[PDB]
Amino acid sequence: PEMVRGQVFDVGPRYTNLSYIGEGAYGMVCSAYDNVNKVRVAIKKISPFEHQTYCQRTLREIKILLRFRHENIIGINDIIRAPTIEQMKDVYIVQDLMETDLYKLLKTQHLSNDHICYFLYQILRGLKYIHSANVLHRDLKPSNLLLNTTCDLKICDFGLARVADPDHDHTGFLTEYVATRWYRAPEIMLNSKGYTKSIDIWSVGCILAEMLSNRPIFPGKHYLDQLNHILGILGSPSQEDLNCIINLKARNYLLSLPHKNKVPWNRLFPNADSKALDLLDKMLTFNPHKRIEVEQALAHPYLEQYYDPSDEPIAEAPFKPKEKLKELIFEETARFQPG
Ligand SMILES: *CC(=O)NCc1ccc2[nH]ncc2c1
Numbered sequence: 001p002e003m004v005r006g007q008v009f010d011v012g013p014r015y016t017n018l019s020y021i022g023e024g025a026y027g028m029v030c031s032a033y034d035n036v037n038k039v040r041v042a043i044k045k046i047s048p049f050e051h052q053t054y055c056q057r058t059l060r061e062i063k064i065l066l067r068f069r070h071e072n073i074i075g076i077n078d079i080i081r082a083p084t085i086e087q088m089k090d091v092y093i094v095q096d097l098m099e100t101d102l103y104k105l106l107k108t109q110h111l112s113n114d115h116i117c118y119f120l121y122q123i124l125r126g127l128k129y130i131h132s133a134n135v136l137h138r139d140l141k142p143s144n145l146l147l148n149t150t151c152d153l154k155i156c157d158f159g160l161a162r163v164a165d166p167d168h169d170h171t172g173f174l175t176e177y178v179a180t181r182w183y184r185a186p187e188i189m190l191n192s193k194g195y196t197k198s199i200d201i202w203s204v205g206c207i208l209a210e211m212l213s214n215r216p217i218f219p220g221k222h223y224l225d226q227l228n229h230i231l232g233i234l235g236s237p238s239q240e241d242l243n244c245i246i247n248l249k250a251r252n253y254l255l256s257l258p259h260k261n262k263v264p265w266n267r268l269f270p271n272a273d274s275k276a277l278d279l280l281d282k283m284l285t286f287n288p289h290k291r292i293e294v295e296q297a298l299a300h301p302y303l304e305q306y307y308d309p310s311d312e313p314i315a316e317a318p319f320k321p322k323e324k325l326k327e328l329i330f331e332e333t334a335r336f337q338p339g
Pocket residue numbers: 021024029042044074095096097098099143144145146155156157
């Protein structure tokens with residue numbers, strides 16, 4: 001069995017010459033030489049079988065990524081596991097190797113307006129497909145946007161994804177949430193379970209802002225601090241947007257705050273393209289019902305050099321305990337077995 005940094009990374013003999021890349025949720029990520037296809041690949045080790053929630057997210061992603069096929073969405077090329085349920089402890093998911101990700105790139109690189117435009121186009125093109133399948137990604141962030149050496153972009157990590165359920169979106173004030181804080185839409189903290197497509201467009205807005213300055217736009221340090229970062233820039237919500245929040249704890253929290261002025265986008269981002277900032281404003285709209293949808297975002301003047309709905313494909317159809325979840329992970333990975 002191959003090893004890397006003390007741990008077993010047991011993918012051979014097909015995959016050899018391992019090098020460490022980084023960490024997934026349930027294990028290590030390495031690159032390896034694929035001896036059949038004669039290219040280096042990425043492989044992530046998943047050890048999920050002790051926990052309901054680890055199993056849930058592992059299985060959700062596998063089911064989604066096997067059903068999806070899109071240029072801007074990472075695929076699964078192979079899955080490695082032991083031949084029987086009794087012997088299966090780890091699962092390895094093999095995927096196309098990508099040089100970097102947007103989190104790593106933003107730490108080190110100034111992006112040209114032309115790169116910002118191209119990255120944003122590819123994110124939304126991928127998101128059009130995901131949303132067309134009635135699926136919500138629910139954890140869009142720079143580290144979930146893979147880039148190769150020619151700046152092709154692929155969305156990854158479908159562990160938090162859900163089928164959209166707008167009729168069951170409503171909840172109370174300060175309801176706990178799982179997805180990454182800095183990219184959470186204001187409504188998560190107020191009255192939303194994150195079951196509508198508008199959740200993903202807010203995160204894309206945050207990513208666009210972050211591409212403009214290399215700094216997260218709303219770097220909250222804790223649950224409600226995230227909301228006050230957002231209101232600090234957007235300003236106090238209007239009467240009409242406040243009246244949309246029927247829940248009294250949420251509404252009265254907002255009414256309790258002093259007046260805050262909107263900070264103009266062109267003052268936060270003085271070197272940004274004015275069309276980029278018009279689109280940014282529409283993605284970072286407080287009221288999720290007024291927020292731009294993915295297909296409108298693609299049609300925005302900022303992206304007119306790339307926009308081509310005939311080349312922005314949609315999905316063929318809508319998408320629909322731990323002993324049982326291990327069995328389901330086993331069955332779902334059967335197609336990659338010798339046999
Ligand atoms: C978002 C995610 O899954 N990150 C881990 C990862 C997947 C695929 C991949 N290909 N090259 C590097 C990679 C990292």
